[PDB]
């Protein structure tokens, strides 16, 4: 029994869609077209949606080392290792499943997603995207600590499971193909090749029809005709970069997606406690930050007079301690309280 073999990818397929920059600023019908970039995760993780499907082979089988993309009319297999994500510099890919990629990217103004096909030909899609993720906590750090202050943050979970979030899907539109038509001496010959072809000619007689068998259009030229293969057996993401199917109305399905956004915990480092010296209603701190650290302070009376500054390097701070008291917060550390003697 294979009663637990539910595979949504048997119904869906990778596709070709519009990309404004396929390299060198020129637009193309991309097999790695960018659909949507999600940046709701406060931890800085990007949830990227593309036209291809990662971790799935053409036979619908799941294989993490493989990737499937639309090659002209038919989907083809490609290596997962060849897949790359970049902004101003390369990104760290944290998870891949179907149309979705999880990536940790450096600061940038564009977002590029690419891969290398079977023929060793590189394909990429560039979209303008301002990426500069906000700071988690009060300290701008580079690497993730094992221990630190536990702060609330959101991330896209690395779980391959699809249970909460979803996308709209529908049948793809008719796929135009000029190779279906040929010039039989001085007429039009439409060869279906075991497919359902929708044809239309700028000639008399039986000029149109949804055919399953070969058709001939006598007293007609090849340029006067339009031929397209219909796709009623497959599903495709409801993409605004692909036209809607003309035959069916507002017909649509829905499928669950991997990596949903969830509330988690982010560990942040606590900046080293500064060298503190005292004076009459005055506190002097010698700040030695290892990275940008936020310093904030307020009076504990009627007039708090809240002040804040990002401390980048070695700086001596002179603060007035009123009779009511002074509260000082240095980065992710718990607030220090000062009172006059």
């Amino acid at each position: 029994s294979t009663k637990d073999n539910f595979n949504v990818y048997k119904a869906t397929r990778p596709y070709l869609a519009h990309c404004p920059d396929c390299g060198e600023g020129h637009s193309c019908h991309s097999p790695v077209a960018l659909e949507r970039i999600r940046n709701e995760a406060t931890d800085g993780t990007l949830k990227i949606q593309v036209s291809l499907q990662i971790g799935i082979k053409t036979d619908d089988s799941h294989d993490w080392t493989k990737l499937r993309y639309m090659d002209n009319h038919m989907p083809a297999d490609a290596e997962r290792a060849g897949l790359f994500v970049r902004t101003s510099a390369p990104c760290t890919i944290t998870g891949t499943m179907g149309h979705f990629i999880l990536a940790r990217c450096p600061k940038g103004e564009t977002l590029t997603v690419g891969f290398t096909d079977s023929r060793k030909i590189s394909h990429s899609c560039t979209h303008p995207f301002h990426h500069d993720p906000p700071v988690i906590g009060r300290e701008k750090f580079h690497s993730r600590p094992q221990h630190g202050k536990e702060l609330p943050c959101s991330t896209y979970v690395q779980s391959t499971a699809a249970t909460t979030e979803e996308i709209e899907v529908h049948m793809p539109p008719d796929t135009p193909d000029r190779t279906l038509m040929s010039q039989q001496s001085g007429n039009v010959k439409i060869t279906v090749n075991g497919q359902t072809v929708r044809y239309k000619c700028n000639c008399g007689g039986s000029n149109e029809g949804l055919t399953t068998t070969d058709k001939v259009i006598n007293n007609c030229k090849v340029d006067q005709c339009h031929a397209a293969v219909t796709n009623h057996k497959k599903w495709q993401y409801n993409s605004p970069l692909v036209p809607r199917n003309a035959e069916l109305g507002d017909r649509k399905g829905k499928i669950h997606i991997p990596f949903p956004l969830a509330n988690v915990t982010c560990r942040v480092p606590k900046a080293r406690n500064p060298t503190v010296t005292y004076g009459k209603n005055q506190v002097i701190m010698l700040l030695y930050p290892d990275h940008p650290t936020l310093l904030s302070y307020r009076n504990m009376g009627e007039e708090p007079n809240y002040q804040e500054e990002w401390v980048m390097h070695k700086k001596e701070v002179v603060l007035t301690v009123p009779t009511e008291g002074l509260e000082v917060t240095w980065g992710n550390n718990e607030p220090y309280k000062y009172w006059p003697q």
Partner: protein
């Protein structure tokens, strides 16, 4: 009991009449049936059953 729709009939979402291998047998018909139940609360029960293939000509 969660109910789904197929033309002029109602059926249990987890049990479509096309089972087993709904998609393998009739891919167009299966997708059309799923599209007709997109607004139904038991859509994901129907999606699970329709896109699962455990054929007769198999040991396991």
């Amino acid at each position: 009991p969660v109910m789904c729709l197929l033309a002029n009939t109602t059926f249990p979402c987890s049990q479509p009449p096309c089972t087993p291998c709904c998609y393998e047998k009739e891919p167009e018909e299966t997708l059309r049936m799923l599209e007709d139940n997109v607004m139904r609360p038991g859509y994901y029960q129907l999606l699970q059953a329709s896109l699962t293939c455990s054929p007769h000509r198999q040991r396991e």
